[PDB]
Amino acid sequence: GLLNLGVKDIGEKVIFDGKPLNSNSGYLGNKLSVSVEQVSIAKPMSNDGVSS
Amino acid sequence: PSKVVSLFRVLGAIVKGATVAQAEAFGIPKSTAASYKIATMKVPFKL
Amino acid sequence: KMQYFLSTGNLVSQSGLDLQQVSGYTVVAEKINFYRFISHFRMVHRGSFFAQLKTTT
Amino acid sequence: NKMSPYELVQHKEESDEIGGYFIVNGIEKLIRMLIVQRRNHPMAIIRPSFANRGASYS
RNA sequence: AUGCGA
DNA sequence: CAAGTGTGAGGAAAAGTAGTTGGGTTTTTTTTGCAGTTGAAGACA
DNA sequence: TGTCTTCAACTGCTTTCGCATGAAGTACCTCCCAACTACTTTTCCTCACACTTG
């Protein structure tokens, strides 16, 4: 469905801890690639109190 | 309840769930201690 | 957030969805008449921004 | 989505309920369809905005 | 404002 | 081969209470018209 | 030295009159709340070993 293509289009959002390490100072490193592979939607449900 | 809490805080008392000693002295279930609010005053005056 | 946006119709985002307005996207199904209910789903709007236009072409 | 009128009535609904709308805070709202430029196809337009960009704009 | 009576 | 004093612990259960968690708002600290106007660059005497 | 001329940026407006029908900003943290299971708690109960006898 269209929405899974949309999240395939958002791609990644990367953030670096300036990933110290002590090229690792002008190329540094430690990549973190955050994305969303699948997106599922479930039909309306209601469970009582909270869980189980 | 909001009025009582606010007024007690204006006096500078500390209001929170009962301690083991407080629950025991007042005879309230320890499980209800955290729900049992107590107002106290200490040495170092409030700011 | 989609309940809110869907409850106001003020869809706003950092790209603007390439759309000329940030309101008017949502309508009450207004079941006062079955004719009105079906009429709602075959109604289409040129958009608020052209409602703002003074001309008639 | 797949209930026959009989079941649909068994669920206290208008035997013919088309649906397509949203219950938000209990108030029935639908998203109004909008007329937008036909996609992917170049539409030749003369617009004074184009001059509104600045000098030397046609 | 959305929609609407005139 | 046997009877008789002295006597400590083992055991049970409902409810509470423990530990761990989670939930949870509440809380709080896109030009699309108009007519004008100012300031502007440039020119001039 | 002094006067004139143009352009563009900015101001301010373009039905009335009523119903509607109000909604909605808000992140960091949370303590409270609801939960499952395990563990612990208060009162009570009943039997046991040993010493001494003949």
From Swiss-Prot, chain A:
Component of the RNA polymerase I (Pol I) complex consisting of 14 subunits: RPA135, RPA190, RPC40, RPA14, RPB5, RPO26, RPA43, RPB8, RPA12, RPB10, RPC19, RPC10, RPA49 and RPA34. The complex is composed of a horseshoe-shaped core containing ten subunits (RPA135, RPA190, RPB5, RPO26, RPB8, RPB10, RPC10, RPA12, RPC19 and RPC40) where RPA135 and RPA190 form the DNA-binding cleft. Outside of the core, RPA14 and RPA43 form the stalk that mediates interactions with transcription initiation factors and newly synthesized RNA. It is found in: Nucleus, Nucleolus. This is DNA-directed RNA polymerase I subunit RPA135. The chain holds residues 59 to 115 of 1203 of the full protein. Three distinct zinc-containing RNA polymerases are found in eukaryotic nuclei: polymerase I for the ribosomal RNA precursor, polymerase II for the mRNA precursor, and polymerase III for 5S and tRNA genes. Present with 14100 molecules/cell in log phase SD medium. DNA-dependent RNA polymerases catalyze the transcription of DNA into RNA using the four ribonucleoside triphosphates as substrates. Component of RNA polymerase I (Pol I) which synthesizes ribosomal RNA precursors. Besides, RNA polymerase I has intrinsic RNA cleavage activity. RPA190 and RPA135 both contribute to the polymerase catalytic activity and together form the Pol I active center. In addition, subunit RPA12 contributes a catalytic zinc ribbon that is required for RNA cleavage by Pol I. Belongs to the RNA polymerase beta chain family.
Swiss-Prot record, chain B:
It is found in: Nucleus, Nucleolus. Changing S2A: Loss of DNA binding. Changing K37A: Loss of DNA binding. Belongs to the eukaryotic RPA49/POLR1E RNA polymerase subunit family. DNA-dependent RNA polymerases catalyze the transcription of DNA into RNA using the four ribonucleoside triphosphates as substrates. Component of RNA polymerase I (Pol I) which synthesizes ribosomal RNA precursors. Besides, RNA polymerase I has intrinsic RNA cleavage activity. The heterodimer formed by RPA34 and RPA49 stimulates transcript elongation by Pol I. Subunit RPA49 can bind both single-stranded and double-stranded DNA. Component of the RNA polymerase I (Pol I) complex consisting of 14 subunits: RPA135, RPA190, RPC40, RPA14, RPB5, RPO26, RPA43, RPB8, RPA12, RPB10, RPC19, RPC10, RPA49 and RPA34. The complex is composed of a horseshoe-shaped core containing ten subunits (RPA135, RPA190, RPB5, RPO26, RPB8, RPB10, RPC10, RPA12, RPC19 and RPC40) where RPA135 and RPA190 form the DNA-binding cleft. Outside of the core, RPA14 and RPA43 form the stalk that mediates interactions with transcription initiation factors and newly synthesized RNA. This is DNA-directed RNA polymerase I subunit RPA49. The gene is RPA49. The chain holds residues 357 to 403 of 415 of the full protein.
